[PDB]
């Protein structure tokens, strides 16, 4: 056995998947995704480190 | 509201300036136009800022 202990990551393989989805009070524009980056500066409490 | 999340356009200043002009300055200047009252026996009129129509260039 190699020196670094092996770890097993059991689950599913998905490209970009955010499982924690709740309701956010503040919302942004519907179509303009160029201003959706503002909510990644002050994120909701549950999506601070997804 | 634009420009708070990305870099604004380099021609937005003159764009909004010309828009503000063609929106309010023409009417503001036509309002201060004086009224000429003469030609009693003749048919004339004054400057009424009610139509205010600009036609597209041919």
DSSP per-residue codes, A1-50: --SSPP----S---SS--------SS---SS-GGGGGGGGTS--GGGS--
Separation of alpha carbons A21 and A47, rounded Å: 8
Token pair of A16 as six digits: 């970009």
Q: Is A35 on the interface with B (CB under 8 A)?
A: yes
Q: Is A37 on the interface with B (CB under 8 A)?
A: yes
Separation of alpha carbons B38 and B44, rounded Å: 8
Torsion angle, CA of A37/A39/A43/A44, rounded to 10 degrees? Answer: -140
Enumerate the residues of chain B whose CB falls inside 8 A of the CB of residue A34: 5-6
Separation of alpha carbons B26 and B48, rounded Å: 13
What experiment produced this structure?
cryo-EM
Enumerate the residues of chain A whose CB falls inside 8 A of the CB of residue B4: 35, 38
The C-alpha angle B51, B55, B58, rounded to 5 degrees, equals 160
For B9, residues 6+ apart whose C-beta sits below 8 A from its C-beta are B15
Q: What is the resolution of this structure in A?
A: 3.0
Enumerate the residues of chain B whose CB falls inside 8 A of the CB of residue A35: 4-6
């Amino acid at each position: 056995y190699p020196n670094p202990p092996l770890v097993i990551c059991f689950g599913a393989a998905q490209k970009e998947f955010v499982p924690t989805v709740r309701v956010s009070h503040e919302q942004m524009h519907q179509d303009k995704y160029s201003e959706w980056k503002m909510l990644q500066w002050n994120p909701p409490e549950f999506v601070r480190a997804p | 509201n634009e420009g708070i999340s990305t870099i604004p356009g380099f021609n937005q200043i003159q764009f909004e300036g010309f828009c503000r002009f063609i929106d309010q300055g023409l009417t503001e200047e036509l309002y201060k136009f004086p009224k000429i009252e003469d030609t009693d026996q003749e048919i004339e009129f004054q400057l009424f800022v009610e139509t205010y129509q600009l036609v597209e260039p041919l």
